[PDB]
Amino acid sequence: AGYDRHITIFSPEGRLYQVEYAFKATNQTNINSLAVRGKDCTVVISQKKVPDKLLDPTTVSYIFCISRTIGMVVNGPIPDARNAALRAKAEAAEFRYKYGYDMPCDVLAKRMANLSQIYTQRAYMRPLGVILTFVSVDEELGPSIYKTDPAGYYVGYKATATGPKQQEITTNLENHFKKSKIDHINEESWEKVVEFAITHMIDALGTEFSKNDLEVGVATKDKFFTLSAENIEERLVAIAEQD
Amino acid sequence: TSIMAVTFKDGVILGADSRTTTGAYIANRVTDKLTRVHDKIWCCRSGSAADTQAIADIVQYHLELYTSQYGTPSTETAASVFKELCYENKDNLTAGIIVAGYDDKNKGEVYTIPLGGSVHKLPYAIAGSGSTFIYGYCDKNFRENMSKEETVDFIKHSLSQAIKWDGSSGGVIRMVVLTAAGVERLIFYPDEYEQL
Amino acid sequence: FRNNYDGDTVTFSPTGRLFQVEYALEAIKQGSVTVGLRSNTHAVLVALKRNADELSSYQKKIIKCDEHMGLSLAGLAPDARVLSNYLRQQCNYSSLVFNRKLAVERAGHLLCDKAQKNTQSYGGRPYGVGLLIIGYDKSGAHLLEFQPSGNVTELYGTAIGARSQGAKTYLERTLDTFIKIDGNPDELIKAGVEAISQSLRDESLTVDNLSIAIVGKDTPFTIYDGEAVAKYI
Amino acid sequence: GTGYDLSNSVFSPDGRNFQVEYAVKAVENGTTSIGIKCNDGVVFAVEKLITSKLLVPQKNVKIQVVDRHIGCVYSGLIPDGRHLVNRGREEAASFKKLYKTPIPIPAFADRLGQYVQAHTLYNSVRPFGVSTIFGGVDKNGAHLYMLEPSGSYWGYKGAATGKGRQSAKAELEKLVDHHPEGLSAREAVKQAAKIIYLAHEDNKEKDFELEISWCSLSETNGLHKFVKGDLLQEAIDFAQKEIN
Amino acid sequence: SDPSSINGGIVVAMTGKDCVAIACDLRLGSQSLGVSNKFEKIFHYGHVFLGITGLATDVTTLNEMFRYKTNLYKLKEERAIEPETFTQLVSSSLYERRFGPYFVGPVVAGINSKSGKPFIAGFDLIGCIDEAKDFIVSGTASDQLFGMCESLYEPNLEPEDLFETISQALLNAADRDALSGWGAVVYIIKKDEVVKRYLKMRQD
Amino acid sequence: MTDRYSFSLTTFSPSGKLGQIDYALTAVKQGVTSLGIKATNGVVIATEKKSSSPLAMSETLSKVSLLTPDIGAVYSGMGPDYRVLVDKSRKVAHTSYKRIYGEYPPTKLLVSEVAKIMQEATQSGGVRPFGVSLLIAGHDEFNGFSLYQVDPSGSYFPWKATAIGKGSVAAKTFLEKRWNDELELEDAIHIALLTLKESVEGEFNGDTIELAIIGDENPDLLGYTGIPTDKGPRFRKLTSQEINDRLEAL
Amino acid sequence: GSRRYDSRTTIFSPEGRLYQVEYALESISHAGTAIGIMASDGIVLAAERKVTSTLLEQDTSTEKLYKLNDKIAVAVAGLTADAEILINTARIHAQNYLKTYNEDIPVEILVRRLSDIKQGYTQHGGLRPFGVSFIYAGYDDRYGYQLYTSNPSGNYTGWKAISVGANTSAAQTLLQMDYKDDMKVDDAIELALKTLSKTTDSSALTYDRLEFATIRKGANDGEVYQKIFKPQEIKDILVKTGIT
Amino acid sequence: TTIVGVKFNNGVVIAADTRSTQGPIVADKNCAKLHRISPKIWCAGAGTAADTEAVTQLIGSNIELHSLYTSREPRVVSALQMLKQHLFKYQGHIGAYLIVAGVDPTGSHLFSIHAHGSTDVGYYLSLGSGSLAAMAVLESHWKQDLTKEEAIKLASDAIQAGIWNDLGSGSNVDVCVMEIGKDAEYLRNYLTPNVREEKQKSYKFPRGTTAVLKESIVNICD
Ligand SMILES: */C1=C\C(=O)NCCCC[C@H](NC(=O)[C@@H](NC(=O)N[C@H](C(=O)O)C(C)C)C(C)C)C(=O)N[C@H]1C(C)C
């Protein structure tokens, strides 16, 4: 009877603990990340924490390029993060092949979400402890942010944050938008949108950053790319000469 | 069909006629036998179209997934996938494919995949029905590390001839330049290459 | 504690142990002692055959896998049959396909990987038998000790089974001596009978009780029983 | 409640996988092994405890090669270690066969990574009881990698695992600091022998046997090879000297 | 050799004024040998009629199949199937055997109970649907029938007239075919009643 | 690997109850309210778009879905379960009907189909029932309009009007009072909006509400012309703007 | 492994009982009552609609009486969903019998097949039984009017009068008290309703809470007929039998 | 069968004849060879009739589901890819030769698929036994940038070429216009240049002409 907490079956409350515990694992990395929509780009900032001196910093990342246009940032342990990445990449290539056009960020999300839903209903598949944020500049929808979770849920956002201090970053952003009245950063260049993201990431977390404390990803028309220590540095210097 | 790939000083150039016939009837006079499997890795298709197209389509998909996981693939690797498909299914395929791609370290490379599904890397390769008529010509005019212009001429002449003699070839000559400077489409019309 | 982590091999104990595997290893200790040792020209096996009644036979402990390879078992007889039989196929396949004698070192790697498979998949059970494989190949004489855990090790000599520790210490002591017993099988064998009598207690090795096997340079793996071993008791 | 540690794919209420965690135990309990990424390759070394004088010396080799350019060393349940390498070998072979080019260290890493992570997904399987340090040289340099039973792995400048994992990590970090410009393959072999000798103190009870192997662009032509004979003794000495 | 020419037989449907008609011969023979003079090739499920020409065994089978299908259909849909729908069922049924078809040429005739409209349709052996507003022909004597119909036929014939027309087409076409005849039956279908008559014809 | 869960996860307890199905229904209770009303010339279904963050865009998510061009569905329970149920219900409509008869399935049968799917997730090996209840509304030539409710047990029944989820008891009572066998579609739409307001805490407008109908044929929504017998879909989701207009006459 | 969550739905109790079959039955005891009475000239099926509402669209509803064949129908008691799954396979089985023999499936034959399917979930599979019990009412030319009953166990038996669902014991007593071999359909129709009337857990026995069906051979024909009364038809017969 | 495709300045049009045949006999004097894959993607098919129909519906059915799942308009390249991979899977055994066209979010498109699975792309295409007659007309009057009307004439003229000059083609001209901004307009029997002349005599028989053996009424009501 008390195994309704070991596998994905209902509890009398009508809950799925294993799904909840899955969510719990997503913070295991203690990294926060947020995504904002530019005028015609989409940026995703994520914290980067490489404590060990023996680690090769360059190999550490929770940002992935699923396709030329879709990028994905994962909040959760890395081994589950990579299992998810790979599957999405495959799902992306197959889609192109079968339908003759690049899989739209939102569709990729829906497909991964449906995939998660299954681990939610089938007993032998454990959910993946990760929250996936997919970003792109859809050829039909414009800048896009779609996030999925271990529950098999997903939705599109004007912007979004994930991780331990998720709530601080969220409300920070919510406020910025209640103010601007628009659903996006009214900026033409992505560098400024990147700076905006990094800025509020600082305001909300009340912390200063160095080129190596961040990880940035940008999605533009027909291409998604990640910045470099230097690309970021130059960006950090920018916010500095405004404060 | 008349298709060739020539490596030169700045990279590589692919060329082809635009005629696809079904018997003596020209089903398409503006065909594009130059197919793109990757950014700077293209191929020349000869043999069954249903087959070379299906093979190409599958290759592009494999190189796309490859990239997603391990970054840009080498021109060699591209030849390798084509070969794998052609060799492994040699009994149900009629595809003669030339694979050409520009690399930064390797510059230009050309792999020809004949009917048996074997692979051959060469300075340049010709293929298709019209190719037979230009073996002597191409052998007597090709040189290594020609300039972009010399090479566009070499291809323009060779194919104009093959188009001349082979009825299964014709229409316009299409080329695709692959160099560090990017990818460039070139087209030449009858009126131009005929009187060469 | 242990009771909640030994219901199958697909479970780790809070300390990193695989009990089901350990229980299997136990079956070996409960098994009749058997000794293995080698020089540079030969490898030898000596085993104590255990019988049920005095009306029953003594169960075979040594099995031949090829003309150059064989082993002795301690533990679940059936499992030795399964494993030896599988080791026979591998030697066989090595010949038929490459016209090459399966090196002892490789036979071991094979056994290890076979065992390992029964310790990570649900429904499977480890093998409850220990093996001592001797063999002469392109690199000389060899001795291997196979543990159900999958751990296969190459040694100069060793023993396994009840009271095995006796013989093992004896060999560990006699080392520099028997390792040089080249060009003389009878000597290597007597050193083997000595090592094993070091694990006696109940009785003393008799003719229909002692079992010896030997492989070497120009010696195809051959087993000796009864009257044949008389000259060593 | 409790019992969240009896099945492999179960999430404890705090979001953990105890089975995997219990696996790590089996690892830490194992022998120590390291990896040092020099400026054009990688060096691998391992601690081989001599349980008795009976073990034929130089015989029970631990370090394994995958293909011809990759090296693997692991601490923990050896059989699980081999099992993993077998898969890596098939994995590498499958790769080469289709893309011709011998599998890139990174790609190989994730190949082993996805496989291992796969064993934390079902209750019908047990996680790997090993941590693996592996790497080699490829189209763009050398790479050192360490893989945990959880399936997690990252690129390291230096890596260690097992009993003496701390002493090592301690020494490896010292190197990293006193060599910002890089270490040479030749030097990494020496330093490795030392670092193994030091890490052997958390097991100073049983005598051991050193085993080094390297893959250097300039030293082994990008091929993985075992350090033997003279160069080996030379390192054993450089270590034996600094251990006093 | 040619399956569709082992047993013989023919069927033809015709539309009229608020009525449809379908008729067939009664021959069933093996090559030249005449065997049965009572093999009807027209069946019905509810108010929908189906005539099947071709290999008798497949004719029999296809009927047994459609009965089975139409029965379950009624249990689940809680109504009798309509001609238009049935036609679709028949089509997909055949095409399902695309690379190993039943050697038949099915003719569907009926009046849509809800629209009152008359309906007829033919299919090739793999389902290709031919929905004619005038007439549909099938059988070893299909050419003769086309010639008969293309001339004889005229729109909105009253039931009594359409009967004469369909009978003459069937009858005369059948006589020019060695594998057809040996008796015939004609169905005159209306919204309310359906009359079945057996014609008198040559027996050679 | 290999799903070794080849046994039922939903079994009979000594009391004769089927735990998981009961718990599944509990999950439905917890979910946002949604209702359905059948008028003499249409059907209406609606629910509340409970935006789970002001940053999330509720449009990029529909609780009301088109199954066929004349059948729509809405739920109460676990959103993700509904999602996959919709896809399945859309496919099953083709695979088991349109591909055989060349026409879309009639409401009762498509419903019957979905029911079966759920029924199976109640007995098959290694799975849990679906944590949702569905309200399917549609129209077909020989059955007119209809409204059905499908439960995680796999049971379903026809309704003149009804609601599920949170304030179902309340809303169900409010409907018994306002429903009659003479309601025009616009009437039901009104009653719908009223019945909904009660279960709504904060904002109540076209951006927080999601409602669709199954009324007359929308040829304007066909996409092409030239074929007499093709008149357009009867299913139509109302726009935010369309909702607010009606809310003023509330 | 997975054995940890296996209910073993198909084992014997120390008393030689089948847990799930027992429990399944327990479930059925709470289902609307279904009664079947067999008279010399026809059979009657009456059942009580469990849970109803003002809003429940009763004309379009069916939760207890299902048509299987043209000469066979069943009354259900238990999980409707489960019932359907079985009813559909029953409907198919009938057709196959027809397709193979060109004759209408004999009542008992259909009933045996259905029972066998149930029996199976009872002996192997590890799945739960169907929470359903059937009252089969049918007619064939070999045994004429027949009345059968089957339940989760997989066993089936014939009856003159029988009931399933809730308060069966109460109903059985009442039927056993007023049934007579020379009854007539009409008589049975009354006895049926009277019984429900006396067992109903509800206030009054109204038409909106019933489902009725009769298998009679309309003399002015010679063929048997299945009639599944419509709401109004029940409302009438209800006033007639004196229950207004 | 004569089917053609012709792109114009803001869309694409496809036309076809209406004659169906089995040997030298006309099976259907007016069948429709224009298939709808999605509201704005239509396919014109030649070859084995049943096949053009079944394959057309199959990919259609899937295009529909996919559209619902992706919440996006169907794209011509999707039907092209789906069709071709299907036809190729069937080693040409599914005798379908199609000209697929339509407009979607990416623009207006015109392709052709051959039973073996290869595809072509152009501004004008023709397939079927009238392919050549039609193509002659096209090669003679097509020009870049045609107005919707010019295109419809050209297309319709090509189909005529086939009707008149090809024995495998005849009857009417069916057209379907897919203009980038609007709804697709399918014009069934846009041209009916082959109406049979009134027959010389009426062949209505005098009742009683046919000799009847037996008679009876049939029971349809269960
Ligand atoms: C376009 C003309 C064309 O492409 N080819 C002319 C040959 C006939 C093709 C097609 N006719 C039919 O499909 C027939 N049925 C059959 O051909 N059945 C085949 C047979 O019995 O040999 C089987 C093997 C499929 C008609 C009766 C349906 C045709 O008319 N094609 C036209 C166009 C596509 C309607």
Q: What are the structure tokens assigned to A62, written together?
A: 């929770």
Q: Which residues contact C93 (CB under 8 A, 6 or more apart)?
A: none
Backbone angles phi, psi at A224, to 5 degrees: -130, 130
User: Which H or E element spans position G73?
Assistant: strand G72-78
Domain boundaries, position D150: 1-244
DSSP letters, D1-48, are ---TTSSTTPPPTTS--HHHHHHHHHHHTS--EEEEEETTEEEEEEEE
Question: 3-class DSSP state for residue H181?
Answer: coil
Residue appearing with tokens 């995958």: D66
Sign of CA dihedral A200, A201, A207, A210: negative
Cβ pair E165:H54 closer than 8 A? no
Q: Does domain H1-222 have CATH number 3.60.20.10?
A: yes
d(CA A204, CA A240): 17
| Contact yes or no for D100/D178 (Cβ under 8 A) | no
Q: Residue B8's beta-bridge partner residues?
A: B11
Determine the topology of domain B1-196 in CATH. Answer: Glutamine Phosphoribosylpyrophosphate, subunit 1, domain 1 (3.60.20)
Q: What are the structure tokens assigned to A123, written together?
A: 């007993």
Q: Resolution (in Å) of the shown entry?
A: 2.7
Instruction: Give the number of other CB atoms < 10 A from CB of residue C29.
Output: 16
Sign of CA dihedral A100, A105, A110, A116: positive
Instruction: Give the number of other CB atoms < 10 A from CB of residue E90.
Output: 25
Cβ pair F226:H188 closer than 8 A? yes
DSSP assigned state of B146: -
* Ligand 1 lined by H20 (C-beta under 6 Å): yes
Q: What are the structure tokens assigned to F157, written together?
A: 């029944």
d(CA F28, CA G126): 28
Instruction: Give the number of other CB atoms < 10 A from CB of residue B154.
Output: 22
Q: Where are the beta strands (DSSP E) in F49-197?
A: 64-68, 71-77, 132-140, 144-150, 156-158, 161-164
β-strand pairing of B11-16 with B173-179: antiparallel
Question: 3-class DSSP state for residue D229?
Answer: helix
Domain boundaries, position A186: 1-243
Q: Which residues of D touch B77 (CB under 8 A)?
A: 99-101
* Ligand 1 lined by H109 (C-beta under 6 Å): no
Q: Which atom of ligand 1 is nearest to the CA of H46?
A: 34
Q: Which of G193, G244, G185 is nearest to G218 (CA)?
A: G185
* Ligand 1 lined by H40 (C-beta under 6 Å): no
- Counting Cα atoms < 13 Å in the Cβ hemisphere of G10 gives 16
Cβ pair G84:F153 closer than 8 A? no
Count up the domains in chain E and report the number: 1
Backbone angles phi, psi at B87, to 5 degrees: -65, -50
Side-by-side strand order, sheet with C140-146 = C62-64, C69-75, C129-137, C140-146, C152-154
Q: Which of H14, H37, H64 to mutate to test the interface with F (most CBs of F within 10 A)?
A: H64
Is residue A7 less than 8 Å (CB to CB) from chain G?
yes
d(CA A118, CA A107): 17
Distance from CA of B90 to the nearest CA of D (A): 16
Instruction: Give the number of other CB atoms < 10 A from CB of residue E130.
Output: 22
| Contact yes or no for A122/A7 (Cβ under 8 A) | no
Cβ pair H88:B50 closer than 8 A? yes
Which chain G residue has the Cα nearest residue C10? G1
Task: Give residue B177's Cα distance to chain centre.
Answer: 11
Side-by-side strand order, sheet with A223-226 = A159-162, A33-37, A42-47, A214-220, A223-226
Is residue F9 less than 8 Å (CB to CB) from chain G?
yes
Q: Which residues of D touch B80 (CB under 8 A)?
A: 98-101
Q: Which of B169, B168, B171 is nearest to B24 (CA)?
A: B168
Is residue F1 less than 8 Å (CB to CB) from chain D?
yes
Cβ pair G99:E72 closer than 8 A? no
From the list B57, B60, B68, the residue facing A92 with the nearest CB is B68
From the list D10, D110, D159, the residue facing A54 with the nearest CB is D159
From the list A98, A104, A106, the residue facing H81 with the nearest CB is A98
Q: Residue B173's beta-bridge partner residues?
A: B188
Q: Which of H114, H119, H120 to mutate to test the interface with B (most CBs of B within 10 A)?
A: H120
* Ligand 1 lined by H127 (C-beta under 6 Å): no
β-strand pairing of F224-225 with H184-191: parallel
Q: What are the structure tokens assigned to G229, written together?
A: 């009364």
- Counting Cα atoms < 13 Å in the Cβ hemisphere of E170 gives 35
Q: Where are the beta strands (DSSP E) in chain A?
A: 33-37, 42-47, 63-65, 71-75, 131-138, 142-148, 154-156, 159-162, 214-220, 223-226
Instruction: Give the number of other CB atoms < 10 A from CB of residue C15.
Output: 12
| Contact yes or no for H7/H123 (Cβ under 8 A) | yes
- Helix ranges restricted to H, chain H: 49-70, 76-89, 131-141, 148-165
The second-level CATH assignment, the architecture, of C1-233 is 4-Layer Sandwich (3.60)
- Counting Cα atoms < 13 Å in the Cβ hemisphere of E176 gives 14
| Contact yes or no for F185/F213 (Cβ under 8 A) | yes
* Ligand 1 lined by E124 (C-beta under 6 Å): yes
Q: Which residues contact G37 (CB under 8 A, 6 or more apart)?
A: G43, G44, G46, G147, G160, G161, G175, G179, G183, G188, G189, G191, G192
**Burial class of residue E111 (count of CB atoms within 10 Å of its CB; 0-12, 13-18, 19+):** buried
| Contact yes or no for B29/B18 (Cβ under 8 A) | yes
Q: What angle do CA F226, H7, H154 make, to 5 degrees?
A: 80
* Ligand 1 lined by H67 (C-beta under 6 Å): no
The alpha carbon of H51 and the centre of ligand 1 are apart by a number of angstroms equal to 9
The alpha carbon of E51 and the centre of ligand 1 are apart by a number of angstroms equal to 22
d(CA C182, CA E102): 83
**Burial class of residue B31 (count of CB atoms within 10 Å of its CB; 0-12, 13-18, 19+):** buried
Q: Which of E91, E97, E128, E129 to mutate to test the pocket of ligand 1 (most atoms within 8 A of CB)?
A: E128
User: Which H or E element spans position E129?
Assistant: strand E129-130
Residue appearing with tokens 């209702």: F35
d(CA H165, CA H142): 20
Side-by-side strand order, sheet with C210-216 = C157-160, C34-38, C42-48, C210-216, C219-225
| Contact yes or no for E173/E146 (Cβ under 8 A) | no
List Cα–Cα distances, F164 to E16, E63, F82, F237, F250, in angstroms.
54, 47, 14, 20, 22
d(CA D138, CA E16): 83
Q: Which residues of F touch G54 (CB under 8 A)?
A: 176
d(CA C9, CA D80): 13
How long is chain B? Answer: 196
Backbone angles phi, psi at B83, to 5 degrees: -55, -50
From the list B1, B75, B112, B151, the catalytic residue is B1
Q: Which residues contact G75 (CB under 8 A, 6 or more apart)?
A: G34, G35, G36, G45, G46, G47, G64, G65, G66, G134, G135, G137, G164, G211, G213
Q: Which residues of B touch H92 (CB under 8 A)?
A: 50
| Contact yes or no for C20/C141 (Cβ under 8 A) | no
Side-by-side strand order, sheet with G210-216 = G161-164, G34-39, G42-48, G210-216, G225-227
* Ligand 1 lined by H30 (C-beta under 6 Å): no
| Contact yes or no for C143/C132 (Cβ under 8 A) | yes
Amino acid at C86: Y
| Contact yes or no for C114/C106 (Cβ under 8 A) | no
Nearest CA to ligand 1 atom 32: H1
Instruction: Give the number of other CB atoms < 10 A from CB of residue E146.
Output: 18
User: Where are chain H's structural domains?
Assistant: 1-222
| Contact yes or no for D199/D164 (Cβ under 8 A) | yes
| Contact yes or no for D210/D196 (Cβ under 8 A) | yes
β-strand pairing of D207-216 with D41-50: antiparallel
List Cα–Cα distances, B72 to B37, B62, B67, H221, in angstroms.
12, 12, 5, 72
From the list F90, F94, F224, the residue facing H183 with the nearest CB is F224
User: Where are chain C's structural domains?
Assistant: 1-233
Distance from CA of D174 to the nearest CA of B (A): 33
Q: What are the structure tokens assigned to G21, written together?
A: 């079959």
Cβ pair B68:A94 closer than 8 A? no
Q: What are the structure tokens assigned to G115, written together?
A: 């029972």
With an 8 Å Cβ cutoff, the interface of chain G facing chain E consists of: 67-68, 91-92, 95-96, 98-99, 102
Q: Which atom of ligand 1 is nearest to the CA of H31?
A: 35
DSSP assigned state of F16: S
Q: Which of D197, D161, D191 is nearest to D178 (CA)?
A: D191
Distance from CA of E122 to the nearest CA of G (A): 25
The dihedral region occupied by F223, where left means phi > 0, alpha psi between -120 and 50, and beta the remainder, is left
Q: Which residues contact F183 (CB under 8 A, 6 or more apart)?
A: F37, F39, F40, F191
Count of CB pairs separated by less than 8 Å, C with G: 5
Task: Give residue D78's Cα distance to chain centre.
Answer: 12
Count up the domains in chain D and report the number: 1
Q: Which of H4, H82, H116 to mutate to test the interface with B (most CBs of B within 10 A)?
A: H116
Q: Which of C25, C26, C27, C32 is nearest to C162 (CA)?
A: C32
User: Which H or E element spans position G210?
Assistant: strand G210-216
| Contact yes or no for B45/B97 (Cβ under 8 A) | yes
Residue appearing with tokens 């299409």: B174
Q: Residue H121's beta-bridge partner residues?
A: H111
Furthest-apart CA atoms within chain G: distance in Å: 67
- Helix ranges restricted to H, A100-223: 105-121, 166-180, 190-205
Q: What are the structure tokens assigned to A174, written together?
A: 């919510």
Question: From which experimental method does this structure derive?
Answer: X-ray
Is residue A86 less than 8 Å (CB to CB) from chain B?
yes
| Contact yes or no for H11/H116 (Cβ under 8 A) | no
The dihedral region occupied by C215, where left means phi > 0, alpha psi between -120 and 50, and beta the remainder, is beta
Residue appearing with tokens 């601007």: A180
Q: Which of C43, C63, C58, C37 is nearest to C203 (CA)?
A: C58
The dihedral region occupied by C187, where left means phi > 0, alpha psi between -120 and 50, and beta the remainder, is alpha
Cβ pair G95:E68 closer than 8 A? yes
Q: Which of D145, D147, D10 is nearest to D76 (CA)?
A: D147
* Ligand 1 lined by H22 (C-beta under 6 Å): yes
Burial readout C173-204 (b: 16 or more C-beta within 10 A, e: otherwise): ebbeebbebeeebebbbbbbbbbbbbbeeeee
Instruction: Give the number of other CB atoms < 10 A from CB of residue H206.
Output: 7
d(CA C147, CA C130): 5
**Burial class of residue D169 (count of CB atoms within 10 Å of its CB; 0-12, 13-18, 19+):** buried
β-strand pairing of D70-76 with D141-147: unpaired
First vs last Cα of chain D: how many Å apart? 53
* Ligand 1 lined by H27 (C-beta under 6 Å): yes
Q: What are the structure tokens assigned to E3, written together?
A: 């399956």
Q: What are the structure tokens assigned to G36, written together?
A: 């079947």
| Contact yes or no for F190/F246 (Cβ under 8 A) | yes
| Contact yes or no for C82/C142 (Cβ under 8 A) | no
Backbone angles phi, psi at A48, to 5 degrees: -125, 125
Q: Which of F214, F48, F56 is nearest to F140 (CA)?
A: F214
Residue B112 a catalytic site member: no
Residue appearing with tokens 């040998």: E33
Between helix F107-120 and helix E56-77 the angle, nearest 10°, is: 90
Q: What are the structure tokens assigned to A34, written together?
A: 């947020």
d(CA F3, CA F126): 8
Question: 3-class DSSP state for residue B103?
Answer: coil
Q: Which of F139, F119, F137 is nearest to F129 (CA)?
A: F119
Q: Which of B141, C95, D4 is nearest to A3 (CA)?
A: D4
Q: What are the structure tokens assigned to D240, written together?
A: 């034996």
Chains A and C touch (3+ CB pairs under 8 A): no
Amino acid at H39: P
Domain boundaries, position G28: 1-244
Task: Give residue A213's Cα distance to chain centre.
Answer: 17
